[PDB]
Amino acid sequence: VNSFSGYLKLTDNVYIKNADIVEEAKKVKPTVVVNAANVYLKHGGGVAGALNKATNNAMQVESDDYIATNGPLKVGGSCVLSGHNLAKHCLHVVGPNVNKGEDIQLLKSAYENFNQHEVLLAPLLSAGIFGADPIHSLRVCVDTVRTNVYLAVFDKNLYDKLVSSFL
């Protein structure tokens, strides 16, 4: 038993809800919140900008120190950093950005990072300003992640289409 509330159960291990990940994170304090990161951990907009703003820019300060030491992530890769006031940990995961021409096949590799964590609150990778089809992203998530994933979908209209077209 865990503290996630109001989710619709899609499969044995995937759950979905219409929620603002920032507000869901502040209420659950999950062990892991996933950020839709870029390779530079520049958290300017989308989910990343919203998560970082919620931390009062502490996420960005920590991220800049990480990059200065380690260099950029790989597309499809991840790193674990602090969850600040939102979660124990933040798993920064880089899905391919279609608006940069990155291969969408890397979306499966991105979701594989979730399997290193027993339970996660997460957005749909490569959705939103990353330009991929959120329905494809949900399909890859379901077919790749084996651990327990609670997906937060900000847009109510999108969620309803996601739930309604799910196979």
| Site for ligand RG5, rule CB under 6 A | 20-22, 36, 46-47, 50, 123, 127-130, 152-154
Q: Would you say 102 and 132 are in contact if contact means Cβ atoms under 8 Å apart?
A: no
Least distance in angstroms from the C-beta of 148 to ligand RG5: 18
Query: What's the rounded Cα separation, in Å, for the pair 68 and 142?
Result: 34
The three-state secondary structure class of 40 is coil
Q: Give Cα 28 distance to the centre of its chain.
A: 15
Q: Would you say 126 and 109 are in contact if contact means Cβ atoms under 8 Å apart?
A: no
Least distance in angstroms from the C-beta of 17 to ligand RG5: 10
Between 99 and 116, whose beta carbon lies closer to ligand RG5? 99
Least distance in angstroms from the C-beta of 21 to ligand RG5: 4
Between 54 and 79, whose beta carbon lies closer to ligand RG5? 54
